A paper describes a structure:
[name] is a phospholipase anchored to membranes via two palmitoylated cysteines located in a hydrophobic membrane-interacting region (MIR). Tecovirimat is an inhibitor of mature virus wrapping widely used to treat mpox patients infected with clade IIb strains. Tecovirimat binding to [name] blocks viral wrapping, but the structural mechanism is poorly understood. We showed that [name] forms a homodimer on membranes, and tecovirimat inserts into a cavity formed between the two protomers.
For the structural studies, we produced a soluble variant of [name] (sF13) by removing the hydrophobic N-terminal tail (amino acids 2–5) and by introducing five mutations in the MIR. We obtained two different crystal forms. In both, sF13 featured a homodimer stabilized by two helices and a β-hairpin with an interface area of 939 Å2, formed by a network of hydrogen bonds involving residues Y253, N259, N267, Y285, S292 and N300. The contact region forms a large cavity of 290 Å3. The hydrophobic N termini and MIRs were located on one side of the dimer, and the two phospholipase D (PLD) catalytic pockets were pointed outwards. Here we report the structure of an [name] homodimer using X-ray crystallography, both alone (2.1 Å) and in complex with tecovirimat (2.6 Å). Structural analysis revealed a large cavity at [name]’s dimerization interface, which is absent in PLD3 and PLD4 homodimers. We hypothesized that this cavity reduces the stability of the [name] dimer.
Residue numbers in the entry:
A (entry chain A): 6 to 173, 193 to 372
B (entry chain B): 6 to 173, 192 to 372
Write the structure that this text describes.
C-alpha cells in the first residue's frame, strides 16, 4: 500500500569551493523539477526570499516567474522581518503572491522558518535550504524531496497554518517510516506533535550513538537583546554521553561575537571532550545543515537550530524518518562531513 | 492549638578562630540540653561517629555515656562506610547501641547522612552537624532545635526507617506550625513523605525575588561510584531563575580544585554568568558544613546534603523546611553575616 520511505530522497547543496561530494539530488535540481512538473500550484515557505544573490537562484526565480505567467498559482510565505526586498520581488514577478506573516502576535518573538516547498499536493521539498541564492548555490544545505501525495498533502496543511497568519502511536509506527513534527506549541492544533518533545525523547532513548550537525548547541541564546536560558536539548546530549556512555559527535559552527555565553559553552564542551565519549568538531564555512541521527536508526532534518529561541517561539516543520535506508544515507552524509577538511577539532 | 514555628530555634557551630558571631543556641549547648533532659531514649543518626576528635566532642560523648549508665536507651546510627572507629566507640561505651546502616543494598551508592538527634519523642535537633568533635567545635555548622513533641515524633519515624537497614500538595503549602520535613532517597519515602528533590526544585522555580544558597558545591557533575554522573536539575533551576526571571541570586560555595575539569569548567561558567546577570558567587576556604537555602525571604531550607546529583539521587537524609516569618528572618540574617564575612571572597580565577 504505502511505499517504505514515502518516496523520500536526500537533497544537498554542495558548494563548488567545498570538498563535499555526493550523488544526491541537488537543491537546484530539486527546485527546478518541482517548478517544471507543476500543474496547479507551488507553495513556498521560508524566513526570507532573496534568490537574486546568485545566478542559479535567479534562474530558479525566473523559472518560477515562467510558471506564474502560465497560470500556475504560486504563493511565497516570508516572515515580516524579511520584508526588505518585498517590493523588488513583486516588481520582478507581479503574478507571484508574496505574503508576510507574523506567527507571534502576542510576544513578536516567533519567526517563520518553515523551509519547505509543496506543489500540486503531490511533490514537496523540506529541509534547511531557504529560498535564497545562497541556500541554492553557495551555502551547504541538507533536505528531503518526495513525490508521495499523502506526504505533500501533510506539508500543504502546514502551509495553510502558516498562511493564516498574514500580516494584512503514530510516532512509534509512522506511515512509510516518515513523519513530520511541528513548532511552535500554540500552532500545533489537536493532532500535530511538538518537535521539542520528539527530539528530546529520541535523545533520551539513545542507546549507542548520537550524531548532530547543527549551527550551535548552546543552553543560552539572545531573544533580541535579552538572554533566554533553555538547556533541555543541551542536557539531553550531555547526560546521554556521561550517564549512558553514548558515543556523541557534535559538528557545530564557530563561536565568538565576544559572547560570554557561547565562550563559556565552548569551554564546557572542550572540558567534556577530554574525559567522555563526546567529540566536537567545528566548521567555519556557511552551513545551514540541521541534522540529527540516533543509533543509526533515526534521522531528523529541520531548519531550526537546537536552541531555546527556535524551539520555544519559531515556526518550522521538521522531517523525521526511521527508514533504515534513508537513515543509512544520512549516516553516510554525516560521516563525510565529520572527516571533511572544513571540520576541525574543538580548539581550547 | 499548634504553636507558630513549632518551637524551632536555630543552632550554630561558630568556631572561635572564625569571625562568625550570633546569639543562637550552640551545637554543644543543644546536644547538652538533649542529653540532660533525656528520660527514656536518645536516638542519633549521622554518617560517622567521631566525637573524641576535640575536647568539647569528647565531653558530649561522656555525657552520653553517663546517660547510658543511668538507664537511658541510646542508639547511634552510622553508615557502614564510617565503621572505622566502631570498635573504639563500643569499647568506650558498652551500653550505647552502635548500628551500621546500608540504605542502598542494591547499588551500594546511597549513604546515611541523617544528621539529627531525637529523644523521648519530645526534643530533637536537625541540621548538618554530625556526631563528631569537628562538627561540635571546629567546623561551622547550622541546624534547628525543637522541643515540640509532634515534630520530634515525625523525626523519630525517620530514625525507624533508617534503623531498619542495619547491616547485621496540601500539607506542604500550609504546614503544621509552618514547619515540615522532606526526605531522601525516593525508595525510602513510603506513601506519605515528600521527596526533598521536588520541594527544593519547586521552591527554586517559584522564586520571585531572591535566592540565597550556602552549600559546599553547586556543580552539575559529580563522581558517584568511580564514574561521573550528570545531574543539573538544581543547577538549572538556579540559573534559569536568574536569567529568565531576573531573580537576585547569591551563591556561597566552597573552594574547588583537585584538578577537576568539571568543577573548574563550572567555575568559569558561573563567573561568565556574573558579568551580565544579578548572580554573585563567593567562595569559602574554611571547614563549613552549612547547607542553607532561602527563597524570597519567606522560605528556609536547612539540611545535611549538598545540592548535587549524588546526594539527591542516593543518599538518606532529612531536610528542615519552614515558612515561619520569624525563623526565616533569623536564617536570612545568618546568611547576610556569612555573605560579608572575612572567610567569604568573591569568585576569582
Amino acid at each position: 500500500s504505502v511505499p517504505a520511505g514515502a518516496k523520500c530522497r536526500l537533497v544537498e547543496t554542495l558548494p563548488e569551493n567545498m570538498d563535499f561530494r555526493s550523488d544526491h539530488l541537488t537543491t537546484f535540481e530539486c527546485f527546478n523539477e518541482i517548478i517544471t512538473l507543476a500543474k496547479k500550484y507551488i507553495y513556498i515557505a521560508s524566513f526570507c526570499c532573496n534568490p537574486l544573490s546568485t545566478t542559479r537562484g535567479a534562474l530558479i526565480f525566473d523559472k518560477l516567474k515562467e510558471a506564474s505567467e502560465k497560470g500556475i498559482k504560486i504563493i511565497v510565505l516570508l516572515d515580516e522581518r524579511g520584508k526588505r526586498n518585498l517590493g523588488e520581488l513583486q516588481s520582478h514577478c507581479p503574478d507571484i503572491n508574496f505574503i508576510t506573516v507574523n506567527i507571534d502576535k502576542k510576544n513578536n518573538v516567533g519567526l517563520l522558518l518553515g523551509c519547505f516547498w509543496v506543489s500540486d499536493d503531490e511533490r514537496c521539498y523540506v529541509g534547511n535550504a531557504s529560498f535564497t541564492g545562497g541556500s541554492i548555490h553557495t551555502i551547504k544545505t541538507l533536505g528531503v524531496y518526495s513525490d508521495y501525495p499523502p506526504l505533500a498533502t501533510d506539508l500543504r496543511r502546514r502551509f495553510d497554518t502558516f498562511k493564516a497568519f498574514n500580516s494584512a502511536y503514530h510516532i512509534k509506527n509512522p506511515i512509510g517510516g516518515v513523519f513530520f513534527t511541528d513548532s511552535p506549541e500554540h500552532l500545533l492544533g489537536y493532532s500535530r506533535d511538538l518537535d521539542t518533545d520528539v527530539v528530546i525523547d529520541k535523545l533520551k532513548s539513545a542507546k549507542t550513538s548520537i550524531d548532530i550537525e547543527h549551527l550551535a548547541i548552546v543552553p543560552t541564546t539572545r531573544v533580541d537583546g535579552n538572554s533566554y536560558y533553555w538547556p533541555d536539548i543541551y542536557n539531553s546530549i550531555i547526560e546521554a554521553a556521561i550517564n549512558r556512555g553514548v558515543k556523541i559527535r557534535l559538528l557545530v559552527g564557530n563561536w565568538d561575537k565576544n559572547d560570554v555565553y557561547s565562550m563559556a559553552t565552548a569551554r564546557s564542551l572542550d572540558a567534556l571532550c577530554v574525559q567522555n565519549d563526546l567529540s566536537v568538531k567545528v566548521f567555519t564555512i556557511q552551513n545551514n545543515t540541521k541534522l540529527l541521527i540516533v543509533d543509526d536508526e533515526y534521522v531528523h532534518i529541520t531548519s531550526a537550530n537546537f536552541d531555546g529561541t527556535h524551539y520555544q517561539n519559531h515556526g518550522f516543520v521538521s522531517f523525521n524518518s526511521i527508514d533504515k535506508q534513508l537513515v543509512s544515507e544520512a549516516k553516510k552524509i554525516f560521516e563525510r562531513d565529520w572527516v571533511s577538511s572544513h571540520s576541525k577539532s574543538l580548539k581550547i
